[PDB]
């Protein structure tokens, strides 16, 4: 089953389950960060989702088809992280992104701190389009966190 929405990625280990990440189902494709699944297959009810496209450097992977998320941050509007933390209800957090300055151009970045298993939570523009996924970032001097707004090439 591939109904559009946001999903937890779980691993059944030892006894109960552990949430290792989060992803987005859109246009029949599942989208998440590579470090969540390590690029391995996923179960969805009784159905198996096979990796289709992925890139360790971008830290992304799509399942069942090519990356479908094509909307981009507009570089000046506030965005929302739809955070789906382990053991907690999905919730929206609005923020004005900062910027990762790289030798190859600027990336929007959000200074919001959640557990590792929140990785893959989508970041949204005001139209509700997913403009990237949360969770590949850096830890700055005081220990707080800044995540790139990571988006694939559609």
């Amino acid at each position: 089953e591939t109904t559009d929405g946001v999903y937890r990625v779980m691993t059944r280990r030892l006894l109960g389950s552990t949430q290792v990440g989060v992803g987005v189902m859109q246009e029949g494709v599942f989208h998440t960060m590579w470090h969540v699944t390590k690029g391995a297959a996923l179960r969805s009810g009784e159905g198996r989702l096979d990796p289709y496209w992925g890139d360790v450097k971008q830290d992304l992977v799509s399942y069942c088809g090519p990356w479908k998320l094509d909307a981009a941050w507009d570089g000046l509007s506030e965005v929302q992280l739809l955070a789906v933390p382990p053991g907690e209800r999905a919730k929206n957090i609005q923020t004005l992104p900062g910027i990762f300055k790289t030798k190859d151009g600027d990336i929007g970045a959000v200074a919001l701190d959640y557990p590792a298993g929140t990785s893959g939570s989508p970041i949204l523009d005001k139209c509700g389009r997913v403009i990237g996924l949360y969770g590949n970032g850096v830890v700055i001097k005081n220990g707080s966190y800044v995540s790139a707004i990571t988006q694939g090439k559609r």
Partner: protein
Amino acid sequence: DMYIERAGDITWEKDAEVTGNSPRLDVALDESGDFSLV
């Protein structure tokens, strides 16, 4: 085994909490997908 389970609809929420600053950081991205502060 890894499996997925639905967690919600994807929507903008109008009455949303607003928080976090807007840092500007010089970073490098290496071939392993790690960002590092420069």
